[PDB]
Amino acid sequence: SMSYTWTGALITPCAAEESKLPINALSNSLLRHHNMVYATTSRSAGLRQKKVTFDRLQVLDDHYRDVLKEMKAKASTVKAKLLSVEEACKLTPPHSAKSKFGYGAKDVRNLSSKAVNHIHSVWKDLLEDTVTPIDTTIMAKNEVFCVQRKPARLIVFPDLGVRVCEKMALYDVVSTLPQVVMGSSYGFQYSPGQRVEFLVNTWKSKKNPMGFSYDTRCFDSTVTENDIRVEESIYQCCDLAPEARQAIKSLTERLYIGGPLTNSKGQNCGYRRCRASGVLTTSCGNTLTCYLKASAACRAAKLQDCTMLVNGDDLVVICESAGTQEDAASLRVFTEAMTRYSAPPGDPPQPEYDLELITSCSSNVSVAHDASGKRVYYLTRDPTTPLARAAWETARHTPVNSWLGNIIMYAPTLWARMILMTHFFSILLAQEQLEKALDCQIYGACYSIEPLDLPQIIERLHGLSAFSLHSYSPGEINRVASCLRKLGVPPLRVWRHRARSVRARLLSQGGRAATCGKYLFNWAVKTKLKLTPIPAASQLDLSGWFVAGYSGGDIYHS
């Protein structure tokens, strides 16, 4: 079974595409080596098509079935509700792709009769037809990176009407089931601090810890019909209304298992027989399937007390070491088993004995010290991509503000604090847009956030320690300094000066702005302040922020 089959029609763009970093009067203050940054375009779609097109083979043994039976037993305890049309509509992002049937995200969010009527019609069709493949659009994603160039990734999604129907039938399922089936192993239930806490405690739970990350080669393409039907059988274990059962069966047969691909010009590009990257179940399905295969593989490889952390296709395993030589052999067997389950590795997995050396979800655990000198572990990552994207956002407004999402997720880091916060608050101040809400993404879901609320948000997600970390590790320091040299990003003395300036402007503004100045830039002054809990913090409603992953799920909140 080929992951895809093609007709020859090109994967066309839906709008003008820029590959080179746009430059304005602000660019240089952040990055000088402009030619290092680029954005992927449909022009490289061909290359990607060749990488994601291959045959899949699967040999399922008793370990696989034993793990599956256990997962289904847990899924049976779940009771999920069918969402109402209005509820599903409110979860639609304001700028989500418009329907091909005469209405857009705006009409959906406002519950217009035209949109609500078509949605209802699509729903009825799902109930009465469980065989006809549903159309999907295939587009080349425009993503920014630093060279040393990768081809654009591909996104496959059904019409807006179908997406609302997916929410109605499955939102409650994909939001509640993974945590029940996988418990503490389900990664999306954790905020960055909780993820670090889980990784550290798990590591400490082993007499002689050993860990490794497992990178599957183009995971979506390795997902087979069997995998997708297996996922449906797990969903069906839930206590569901009969109408929901029918809808899930229908969406599985007509959309999740596969279907035709249509480019932006309306031409048939081919056919998909693997995971669709732009459906509501993409994250939950990848997570369940990755966890199923990995769990079974741990048994085949005989790993001791293998604890796992799964986020979609991202997998991290921490177990009890049985000796260096043996761990290496076990990992080999693990990879062989994963391969038999149609989850071949991209990069061969290697055993690590230093927690901080394991990268998962493009991040790693590191350590610093708080105002009290106490050791504190936090999540960080290589800042190259975040900075390249920040450069792009410096001269171009985008649907998703990566800089804001990165400040929220990596607030305790040296780079997010010194550069991202300083640079963007400087711009927000000059343009008087501090109070303007911006969209960013957390675990795949889109959120509208006011920059002025960052202090509270950071306090709630990372704790006051995020505003006073210091004495970072040499490893982290060198990686940050190397990245800055590579990109041609100005040094500390420059950022410290800009930070003091920004901090002074914010303080004068008063209100929330002053709070931003005091907490976000305390590191920039020589005579540090108090920094005590923020009252308004408790006000913020962060429920649903770290519950589940919705990558490509077309999900919006507030």
Ligand X SMILES: CC(=O)c1ccc(-c2cc(NS(=O)(=O)c3ccc(C)cc3C)c(C(=O)O)s2)s1
For ligand X, the binding residue among 4, 472, 519, 550 (CB under 6 A) is 472
Closer of 170 and 419 to ligand X (Cβ) = 419
Sequence-separated (6 or more) residues with CB below 8 Å from residue 499: 418, 421, 422, 521, 523, 524
| CB closer to ligand X, 258 vs 383 | 383
- 414 forms part of the interface with ligand X (CB under 6 A): yes
How far is residue 330's CA from residue 156's CA, in Å, rounded to a whole number? 36
Number of residues assigned to the chain: 558
User: CA dist 389 to 323, 356, 401, Å?
Assistant: 42, 25, 9
Binding string, residues 195-234; x marks residues near ligand X by CB under 6 A: ----------------------------------------
- Kindly state the smallest distance separating residue 352's Cβ from ligand X, in Å: 23
Using the rule CB under 6 A, is 418 a contact of ligand X? yes
Residue from 57, 329, 477, 536 touching ligand X (CB under 6 A): that is 477
Element of type H or E holding 367: strand 364-369
CB of 422 to ligand X, least distance (A): 9
Kindly state the helix (H) or strand (E) to which residue 376 belongs, with its residue range.
strand 375-380
In angstroms, give the least distance from the CB of 273 to ligand X. 48
Kindly tell me which of 275 and 498 has the beta carbon lying closer to ligand X.
498
- We find the least distance from the C-beta atom of residue 506 to ligand X, in angstroms, to be 16
Please give the helix or strand (H or E) that residue 365 lies within, else none.
strand 364-369
Q: Which residues from 331-360 bind ligand X, rule CB under 6 A?
A: none
Question: Least distance to ligand X from the beta carbon of 524, Å?
Answer: 7
**Interface of this chain with ligand X, residues 163 to 182, rule: CB under 6 A:** none
The token pair that represents 488 in the structure block: 């041609």
CA distances (Å), origin 450, targets 405, 438, 453:
12, 6, 6
Phi-psi region of 536 (alpha: psi -120 to 50; beta: other; left: phi over 0): alpha
Q: How many residues bind ligand X (CB under 6 A)?
A: 14
CB-nearer residue toward ligand X: 64 or 425 = 425
Which string of DSSP letters, residue by residue, matches 144-180? EEE---PPPPEEEEE-HHHHHHHHHHHHHHHHHHHHH
Q: Which of 417, 423, 462, 518 binds ligand X (CB under 6 A)?
A: 417
- Please report how close the Cβ of residue 498 comes to ligand X at its closest, in angstroms: 12
Nearer residue to ligand X within complex by CB, 116 or 484:
484
Give the Cα separation of 303 and 291 in Å (integer): 15
Place of tokens 């798990």: 202
Q: Which is nearer to ligand X, 218 or 484 (CB)?
A: 484
Binding residues for ligand X (CB under 6 A): 414, 417-418, 470-472, 477, 480-481, 484, 491-493, 523
